Design a protein around this ligand. Structure first.
Ligand SMILES: *[C@@H]1O[C@H](CO)[C@@H](O[C@@H]2O[C@H](CO)[C@@H](O)[C@H](O)[C@H]2NC(C)=O)[C@H](O)[C@H]1NC(C)=O
Lengths: 61, 531
């Protein structure tokens, strides 16, 4: 799949995730700042909310 | 050539000429003004840049101070226009000078700009802060600098020599001192330095105003949509180290010395990765590492100081935009998004009040809801959307700015207040957001004059009209033409007059969102106190 990819200190860029899903890691509670998007479906936490997707393509936006 | 070479106390510099629809300007970008805060220096107050042999390349902007990059909306201008446009580095303490061409013959008034970004972001190299137009148009020296942000510039362990805090404001000060010693080399006049900044940059300005050591470095101040007394501008020593410790823990650290030592070993990005975790949560318009009331830079709380201060012989220009609040709601307020009119439900509206106004009793929210609710149309979305937007704006920007203005004016200072209410034609944000936070800057800097950009012919004139105001203030401590055009009255604590800044001529109005600010400044306090 064609998803977004970036870090805490970088800008978002399209990248080919392929078969695996994608993710949108962000601060769980407001300010719900975006901390990173990429391939896969990584674990979150109390502060970190991770939203995974697969079909949409560029869905981890 | 010729005047693209200047020698300062530290050494020689090789600037460059920038082109403008009116003429060229001489710009010297990336002048090092402090020894880079690397490793052992990280977290410590800046140290003066040691004299260099040879010539320094001042033809381009230097590294942006290491920071978090707001990736909320990938590929969106309204969001990316503030992102760093240069490489991130801890080695980032550089300043920039824009001087008229040909270099002025007599010492000309200087304007120093401190960018905003909630103390967690920002850079003087952004396109919207390009001095070339304002310098060319008003022929005045313009200086802007880079100051550390995030933990790098504000993480504090109150009382420690390893992580004192406020080093970000110290960077700013070091630059103003550099200006006092070298600005003359560009025809700049050190006896006429006017500071102007927006948001946290305006908050910074206000703190230099409340901090004695900074007082001999400027003569006039301009706070745009931000004040030192805002609920987000400062944090107490308590909170300060609670946060600086949470960060240390999250990053696996470890005695302050022991803690800071460990901290200093962590890669910069590792620290930024956990920056937003330390926030006491549940809110909008709140940033992790901000200035601390340490008793040092700030001998007391901004509020305390503003009240007790004697401001005679001072001229300040203060103002806000038509919709301070809007911008922030999309970062958590339930039902808000840039991708639709965010026509919230009375339900979300009530939950948003709690978001936009953190740490406050349930009864306190009731008081807010009571005031900001139109009881003839309690369920109308359109109004609740504008209402939550006012709550945030008023609480965070308008009422804090309004209060300061009243105190300053009331206590000896000449004050001028404005309300920038004109949405740019090029504006990339939704229409429901009106004239958001930070969208008056592009005009103050005369960006409409830039060809590559599609502004209207009427906006190009507006910007010129605005630049004149700012310049006249810098030069004389008074906005209007030092004529037969609408006059800008000073802001008195009583009459509370200000002018609306749009394409139409100056219109004077009374009351800076007065009815609302009485709630925030007079009542809300008494309420919380008694509970
Ligand atoms: C405008 O966009 C926002 C955000 O995409 C929408 O809000 C979401 O609404 C759904 C319900 O359909 C909730 O489950 C989500 O939690 C909301 N997201 C958040 C936290 O804001 C909103 O519905 C849209 N408004 C319009 C015009 O339909």
């Amino acid at each position: 799949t064609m998803c977004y990819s970036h870090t805490t200190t970088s800008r978002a860029i399209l990248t080919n995730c392929g078969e695996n899903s994608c993710y949108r890691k962000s601060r769980r509670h407001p300010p719900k700042m975006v901390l990173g998007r990429g391939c896969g479906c990584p674990p979150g936490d109390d502060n970190l909310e991770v939203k995974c997707c697969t079909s949409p393509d560029k869905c981890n936006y | 050539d010729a005047e693209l070479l200047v020698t300062v106390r530290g050494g020689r510099l090789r600037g460059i000429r920038l082109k403008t629809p009116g003429g060229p300007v001489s710009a010297f970008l990336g002048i090092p003004f402090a020894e880079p805060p690397m490793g052992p220096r990280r977290f410590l107050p800046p140290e003066p840049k040691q004299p260099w042999s040879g010539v320094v390349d001042a033809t381009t902007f230097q590294s942006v101070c290491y920071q978090y990059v707001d990736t909320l909306y990938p590929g969106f201008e309204g969001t990316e226009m503030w992102n760093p446009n240069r490489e991130l580095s801890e080695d980032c303490l550089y300043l920039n000078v824009w001087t008229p061409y040909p270099r002025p013959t007599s010492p000309t008034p200087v304007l120093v700009w401190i960018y905003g970004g909630g103390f967690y972001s920002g850079a003087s190299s952004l396109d919207v802060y390009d001095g070339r137009f304002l310098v060319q148009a008003e022929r005045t020296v313009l200086v802007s600098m880079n100051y550390r942000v995030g933990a790098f510039g504000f993480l504090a362990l109150p009382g420690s020599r390893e992580a004192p805090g406020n080093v970000g404001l110290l960077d700013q000060r070091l630059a103003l001192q550099w200006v006092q010693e070298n600005v003359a080399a560009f025809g700049g006049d050190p006896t006429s330095v006017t500071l102007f900044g927006q948001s946290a940059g305006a908050a910074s300005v206000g703190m230099h105003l409340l901090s004695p050591p900074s007082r001999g470095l400027f003569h006039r101040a301009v706070l745009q949509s931000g004040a030192p007394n805002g609920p987000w501008a400062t944090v107490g020593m308590g909170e300060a180290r609670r946060r600086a410790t949470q960060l240390a823990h999250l990053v696996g650290c470890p005695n302050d010395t022991e803690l800071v030592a460990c901290l200093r070993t962590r890669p910069a990005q590792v620290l930024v990765n956990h920056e937003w975790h330390v926030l006491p949560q549940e809110s909008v318009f709140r940033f992790s590492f901000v200035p601390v009331v340490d008793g040092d830079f700030l001998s007391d709380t901004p509020e305390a100081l503003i009240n007790a201060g004697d401001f005679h012989g001072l001229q300040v220009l203060v103002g806000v935009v038509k919709d301070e609040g809007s911008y922030f709601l999309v970062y958590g307020a339930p039902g808000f998004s840039k991708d639709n009119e965010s026509l919230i439900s009375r339900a979300e509206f009530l939950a948003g009040v709690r978001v936009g106004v953190p740490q406050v009793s349930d009864l306190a929210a009731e008081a807010v809801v009571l005031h900001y609710t139109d009881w003839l149309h309690p369920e109308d979305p359109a109004r609740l959307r504008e209402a939550l937007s006012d709550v945030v704006g008023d609480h965070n920007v308008v009422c804090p700015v309004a209060q300061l203005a009243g105190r300053l004016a009331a206590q000896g200072a000449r004050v001028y207040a404005y309300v920038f209410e004109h949405r740019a034609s090029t504006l990339s944000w939704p229409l429901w957001m009106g004239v958001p936070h930070g969208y008056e800057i592009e005009f103050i800097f005369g960006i409409p004059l830039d060809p590559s950009r599609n502004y209207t012919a009427e906006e190009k004139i507006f910007a010129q009209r605005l630049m004149r105001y700012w310049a006249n203030f810098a030069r004389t401590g008074d906005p209007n033409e030092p004529p037969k055009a609408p006059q800008w009255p000073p802001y008195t604590a009583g009459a509370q007059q200000y002018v609306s800044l749009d394409l139409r001529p100056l219109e004077v109005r009374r009351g800076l969102r007065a009815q609302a600010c009485a709630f925030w400044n007079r009542f809300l306090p008494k309420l919380l106190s008694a509970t």
